[PDB]
Design an enzyme around this catalytic site. Structure first.
Site, PDB file in Angstrom:
ATOM      1  N   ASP A 131       5.465 -10.043 -23.308  1.00 21.96           N
ATOM      2  CA  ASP A 131       4.600 -10.796 -22.396  1.00 21.96           C
ATOM      3  C   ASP A 131       3.117 -10.605 -22.763  1.00 21.96           C
ATOM      4  OD1 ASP A 131       3.966 -12.504 -20.223  1.00 21.96           O
ATOM      5  OD2 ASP A 131       4.104 -10.978 -18.697  1.00 21.96           O
ATOM      6  N   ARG A 135      -4.049 -12.298 -19.558  1.00 23.80           N
ATOM      7  CA  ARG A 135      -3.876 -11.779 -18.205  1.00 23.80           C
ATOM      8  C   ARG A 135      -3.319 -10.352 -18.165  1.00 23.80           C
ATOM      9  NH1 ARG A 135       1.672 -12.825 -17.958  1.00 23.80           N
ATOM     10  NH2 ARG A 135       2.096 -14.597 -19.354  1.00 23.80           N
ATOM     11  N   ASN A 136      -2.646  -9.923 -19.240  1.00 23.00           N
ATOM     12  CA  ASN A 136      -2.111  -8.566 -19.368  1.00 23.00           C
ATOM     13  C   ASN A 136      -2.989  -7.651 -20.233  1.00 23.00           C
ATOM     14  OD1 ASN A 136       0.141  -8.762 -17.679  1.00 23.00           O
ATOM     15  ND2 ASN A 136       1.368  -9.741 -19.278  1.00 23.00           N
ATOM     16  N   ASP A 149       1.103  -3.925 -18.938  1.00 26.60           N
ATOM     17  CA  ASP A 149       2.300  -4.618 -18.471  1.00 26.60           C
ATOM     18  C   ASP A 149       3.477  -4.186 -19.327  1.00 26.60           C
ATOM     19  OD1 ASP A 149       4.079  -6.142 -17.014  1.00 26.60           O
ATOM     20  OD2 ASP A 149       3.584  -8.013 -18.009  1.00 26.60           O
TER      21      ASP A 149
HETATM   22  C1  AS6 Z   1      -2.296   0.065 -11.761  1.00 27.95           C
HETATM   23  C2  AS6 Z   1      -1.606  -0.634 -12.885  1.00 27.95           C
HETATM   24  C3  AS6 Z   1      -0.417  -0.112 -13.364  1.00 27.95           C
HETATM   25  C4  AS6 Z   1       0.256  -0.733 -14.392  1.00 27.95           C
HETATM   26  C5  AS6 Z   1      -0.268  -1.877 -14.961  1.00 27.95           C
HETATM   27  C6  AS6 Z   1       0.434  -2.590 -16.081  1.00 27.95           C
HETATM   28  O1  AS6 Z   1       0.597  -1.714 -17.193  1.00 27.95           O
HETATM   29  C7  AS6 Z   1      -1.456  -2.394 -14.489  1.00 27.95           C
HETATM   30  C8  AS6 Z   1      -2.138  -1.789 -13.445  1.00 27.95           C
HETATM   31  N1  AS6 Z   1      -3.345  -2.349 -12.977  1.00 27.95           N
HETATM   32  C9  AS6 Z   1      -4.638  -1.917 -13.383  1.00 27.95           C
HETATM   33  C10 AS6 Z   1      -4.712  -0.821 -14.230  1.00 27.95           C
HETATM   34  C11 AS6 Z   1      -5.960  -0.421 -14.601  1.00 27.95           C
HETATM   35  N2  AS6 Z   1      -7.067  -1.054 -14.173  1.00 27.95           N
HETATM   36  C12 AS6 Z   1      -6.919  -2.102 -13.360  1.00 27.95           C
HETATM   37  N3  AS6 Z   1      -8.112  -2.723 -12.937  1.00 27.95           N
HETATM   38  C13 AS6 Z   1      -8.211  -3.929 -12.209  1.00 27.95           C
HETATM   39  C14 AS6 Z   1      -9.452  -4.240 -11.684  1.00 27.95           C
HETATM   40  C15 AS6 Z   1      -9.666  -5.399 -10.955  1.00 27.95           C
HETATM   41  N4  AS6 Z   1     -10.907  -5.745 -10.402  1.00 27.95           N
HETATM   42  C16 AS6 Z   1     -12.002  -4.904 -10.808  1.00 27.95           C
HETATM   43  C17 AS6 Z   1     -13.199  -5.309  -9.979  1.00 27.95           C
HETATM   44  O2  AS6 Z   1     -13.415  -6.713 -10.172  1.00 27.95           O
HETATM   45  C18 AS6 Z   1     -12.323  -7.456  -9.615  1.00 27.95           C
HETATM   46  C19 AS6 Z   1     -11.125  -7.183 -10.487  1.00 27.95           C
HETATM   47  C20 AS6 Z   1      -8.605  -6.255 -10.755  1.00 27.95           C
HETATM   48  C21 AS6 Z   1      -7.369  -5.954 -11.276  1.00 27.95           C
HETATM   49  S1  AS6 Z   1      -6.064  -7.141 -10.966  1.00 27.95           S
HETATM   50  C22 AS6 Z   1      -4.718  -6.220 -10.287  1.00 27.95           C
HETATM   51  O3  AS6 Z   1      -6.564  -8.064  -9.950  1.00 27.95           O
HETATM   52  O4  AS6 Z   1      -5.674  -7.649 -12.285  1.00 27.95           O
HETATM   53  C23 AS6 Z   1      -7.147  -4.800 -12.006  1.00 27.95           C
HETATM   54  N5  AS6 Z   1      -5.730  -2.567 -12.942  1.00 27.95           N
HETATM   55  C24 AS6 Z   1      -3.277  -3.688 -12.368  1.00 27.95           C
HETATM   56  C25 AS6 Z   1      -3.441  -4.822 -13.363  1.00 27.95           C
HETATM   57  C26 AS6 Z   1      -2.032  -3.896 -11.515  1.00 27.95           C
HETATM   58 MG    MG Z   2       6.434  -7.586 -19.630  1.00 28.71          MG
HETATM   59 MG    MG Z   3       4.929  -9.496 -17.440  1.00 27.48          MG
END
Ligand code: AS6
Ligand code: MG
Ligand code: MG
Ligand code: MG
Length: 270
Positions: A131, A135-136, A149
């Site tokens: 994937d 977006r990932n 992801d």
């Molecule tokens: C927590 C986590 C665990 C596993 C995975 C996949 O391997 C991903 C994550 N995630 C993480 C991991 C590390 N950092 C982030 N940061 C993040 C920051 C923002 N904001 C920062 C301030 O400005 C607005 C956007 C928005 C998102 S999101 C969930 O809307 O895509 C993620 N997210 C999410 C993508 C679920």
């Molecule tokens: Mg996947």
């Molecule tokens: Mg996926």
């Protein structure tokens, strides 16, 4: 590995909507360690819990600057959580849409190089991502791009695996469900196109079915506006129908490094 006491986590803002629960920003403070910012994923059947946690199992075994770092999990306590390093700029596609036209070609190539290095590592570990999409990709305050992801679930032929991401998927992976690092190279080309288009949707004017038909009929995405011809050529190489003819990730990194060394080459646009 990395089971952590829920007492060490302070949940701050809800920052996104995750595929199976909320996404939060928080603080992790464990005895003997400095406090860190964390991103938090929350969670069902036991099968679904094991699929959810499979992400943490695999993430915990990777260590690379372009792969999102696992901080820990909360399992011996509900709700189940996955904690990772916090990426201040969130997802790359939306980050680029917010910053449309505002980063230089050399900056964009550095982002693509980071993603390519992350993929080179995954390929070296025999991990096929399946994937790979902008977006990932997550972006930190210094514009470092990290692949995210992960997990060991399969796509839908209920499981948390999801549907095959048609717009990012190599033709043989759609047709035969044969996912390899070479099909990831195809997706990587799509990611290149997303980055050079500042987060435009791939094939924006086509349905999933139109995209399947187009690719079979030799259609390939055109160069984004202002895109160096060398970068578009690398996209086309990633999109060869014969998967064995696509560049491998070490060759992708090496091609991006040559561009970075020879930035005048990036001035040629169609
Ligand atoms: C927590 C986590 C665990 C596993 C995975 C996949 O391997 C991903 C994550 N995630 C993480 C991991 C590390 N950092 C982030 N940061 C993040 C920051 C923002 N904001 C920062 C301030 O400005 C607005 C956007 C928005 C998102 S999101 C969930 O809307 O895509 C993620 N997210 C999410 C993508 C679920
Ligand atoms: Mg996947
Ligand atoms: Mg996926
Ligand atoms: Mg290492």
């Amino acid at each position: 590995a990395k089971e952590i006491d829920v007492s060490y986590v302070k949940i701050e803002e809800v920052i996104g909507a995750g595929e199976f629960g909320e996404v939060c920003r928080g603080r992790l403070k464990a005895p003997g360690k400095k406090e860190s910012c964390v991103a938090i994923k929350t969670l069902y059947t036991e099968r679904q819990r094991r699929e959810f946690l499979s992400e943490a199992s695999i993430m915990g075994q990777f260590e690379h600057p372009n792969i999102i770092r696992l901080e820990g999990v909360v399992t011996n306590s509900m709700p189940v959580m996955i904690l990772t390093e916090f990426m201040e700029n969130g997802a790359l596609d939306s980050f680029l849409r917010l910053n449309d036209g505002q980063f230089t070609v050399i900056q964009l190539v550095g982002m693509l190089r980071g993603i390519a290095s992350g993929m080179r590592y995954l390929a070296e570990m025999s991990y096929v991502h399946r994937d790979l999409a902008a977006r990932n990709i997550l972006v930190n305050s210094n514009l470092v791009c990290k692949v995210s992801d992960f997990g060991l679930s399969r796509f839908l032929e209920s499981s948390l695996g999801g549907k095959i991401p048609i717009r990012w998927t190599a033709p043989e992976a759609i047709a035969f469900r044969k996912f390899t690092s070479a099909s990831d190279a195809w997706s990587y080309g799509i990611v290149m196109w997303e980055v050079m288009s500042f987060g435009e949707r791939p094939y924006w004017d086509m349905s999933n079915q139109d995209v399947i038909n187009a690719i079979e009929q030799d259609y390939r995405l055109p160069p984004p506006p202002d895109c160096p011809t060398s970068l578009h050529q690398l996209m086309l190489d990633c999109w060869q129908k014969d998967r064995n003819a696509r560049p491998r990730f070490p060759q992708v990194v090496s091609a991006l490094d040559k561009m970075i060394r020879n930035p005048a080459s990036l001035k040629i646009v169609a």
